[PDB]
Amino acid sequence: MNLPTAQEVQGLMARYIELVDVGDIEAIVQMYADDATVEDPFGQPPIHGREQIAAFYRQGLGGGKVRACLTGPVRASHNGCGAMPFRVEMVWNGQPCALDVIDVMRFDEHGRIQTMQAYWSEVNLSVRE
Amino acid sequence: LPTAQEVQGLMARYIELVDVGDIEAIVQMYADDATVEDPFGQPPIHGREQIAAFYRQGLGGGKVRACLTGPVRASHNGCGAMPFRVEMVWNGQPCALDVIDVMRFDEHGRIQTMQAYWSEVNLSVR
Numbered sequence: 036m037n038l039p040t041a042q043e044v045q046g047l048m049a050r051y052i053e054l055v056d057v058g059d060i061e062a063i064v065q066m067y068a069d070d071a072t073v074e075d076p077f078g079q080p081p082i083h084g085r086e087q088i089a090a091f092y093r094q095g096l097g098g099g100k101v102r103a104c105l106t107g108p109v110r111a112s113h114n115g116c117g118a119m120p121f122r123v124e125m126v127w128n129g130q131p132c133a134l135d136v137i138d139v140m141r142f143d144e145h146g147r148i149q150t151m152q153a154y155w156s157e158v159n160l161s162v163r164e
Numbered sequence: 165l166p167t168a169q170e171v172q173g174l175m176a177r178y179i180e181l182v183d184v185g186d187i188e189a190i191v192q193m194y195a196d197d198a199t200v201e202d203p204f205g206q207p208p209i210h211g212r213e214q215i216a217a218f219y220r221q222g223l224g225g226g227k228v229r230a231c232l233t234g235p236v237r238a239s240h241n242g243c244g245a246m247p248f249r250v251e252m253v254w255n256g257q258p259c260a261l262d263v264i265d266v267m268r269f270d271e272h273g274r275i276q277t278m279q280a281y282w283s284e285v286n287l288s289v290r
């Protein structure tokens with residue numbers, strides 16, 4: 036594909052969250068441009084290129100015990116970009132938890148993720164109480 | 165720069181204000197030389213009077229409601245992003261729209277940039 040249409044951005048970003056959910060790291064990494072960046076969290080130093088991005092998703096996911104679901108619609112532009120609200124479910128201090136996240140993404144004119152920026156800090160982590 | 169908890173406060177305070185239609189307090193939350201993109205894909209709007217003409221335009225009828233539809237996500241470098249829904253009338257059709265703003269706050273606590281993510285794919289007749 037060409038540069039994704041708004042409909043195309045909605046479908047690309049929804050598939051990305053299933054991959055994170057199902058932990059299919061190599062498929063995640065194919066969605067990214069070869070020279071992509073990941074800023075996650077946003078505010079931390081960017082991670083360049085597919086080798087560094089695969090290891091990061093291996094770090095983050097490879098241990099298992101992480102479900103990610105959208106909590107609302109993907110918001111898609113007309114310049115290849117979209118934003119999405121989701122929740123991650125995993126393990127913190129041996130007890131389930133949850134991190135509410137928004138990822139923005141900019142795609143390419145080949146339809147691959149050129150950037151990504153994941154918003155969140157500890158204010159968005161919550162636990163049973 | 166403002167804290168992650170404080171960003172959850174400035175951004176929520178900004179939807180409060182959209183929701184009741186106070187354009188002058190919305191404009192005061194901004195910086196000098198702020199920019200607005202909105203929608204992200206269109207050139208930026210910059211100037212303080214222009215940023216007012218923009219809120220006057222969208223909002224002015226008194227008939228646009230804004231509410232959050234999830235929590236504000238905030239970073240530790242003075243930035244946040246938020247999901248919300250706008251309801252408005254559009255030439256007699258009752259509609260809705262789904263939106264994500266991303267905002268960065270200067271050290272003075274004012275918006276330095278705002279980028280609003282949405283499209284016509286984010287429109288629904290209610």
Ligand SMILES: C[C@]12CCc3c(ccc4cc(O)ccc34)[C@@H]1CCC2=O
Binds near residue numbers: 095155
């Ligand atoms: C890595 C992680 C699980 C997945 C995840 C997190 C944060 C942001 C994310 C953004 C994504 O686009 C996909 C997955 C995550 C969590 C932070 C701590 C944790 O367990």
Ligand SMILES: C[C@]12CCc3c(ccc4cc(O)ccc34)[C@@H]1CCC2=O
Binds near residue numbers: 228
């Ligand atoms: C401008 C608008 C009402 C308000 C609004 C819209 C879109 C994005 C927004 C982002 C905001 O932070 C505050 C308000 C809006 C609508 C698009 C069409 C319309 O009538």
Ligand SMILES: [Cl-]
Binds near residue numbers: 247248
């Ligand atoms: Cl939402």
Ligand SMILES: [Cl-]
Binds near residue numbers: 106
């Ligand atoms: Cl949400």
Ligand SMILES: [Mg+2]
Binds near residue numbers: 056057
């Ligand atoms: Mg799944």
Ligand SMILES: [Mg+2]
Binds near residue numbers: 068143
């Ligand atoms: Mg390229």
